[PDB]
Design a protein around this ligand. Structure first.
Ligand SMILES: [Zn+2]
Ligand SMILES: [Zn+2]
Length: 79
């Protein structure tokens, strides 16, 4: 990313499939009017609707521990 230095929260548009940053979201949405949910690759979390907003950092998240359980991921939208 053409920026002074690296170190920001990135996201993955589940609408088309592009690497959209936190601040980029605003811009992206402009073109992509199909962005419903977003995911953070930095740590790995799902943010439906306007949830990603709250997500400002990836610290204090016990994600590493766990994960295992079931391979299958795809499922009913209603989660
Ligand atoms: Zn998109
Ligand atoms: Zn994150």
């Amino acid at each position: 990313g053409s920026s002074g230095s690296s170190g920001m929260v990135f996201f993955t548009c589940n609408a088309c499939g592009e690497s959209v940053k936190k601040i980029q979201v605003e811009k992206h949405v402009s073109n992509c009017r199909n962005c419903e949910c977003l995911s953070c690759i930095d740590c790995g979390k799902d943010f439906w609707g306007d949830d990603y907003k709250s997500h400002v950092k990836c610290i204090s998240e016990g994600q590493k521990y766990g994960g295992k359980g079931y391979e299958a991921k795809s499922g009913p939208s209603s989660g």
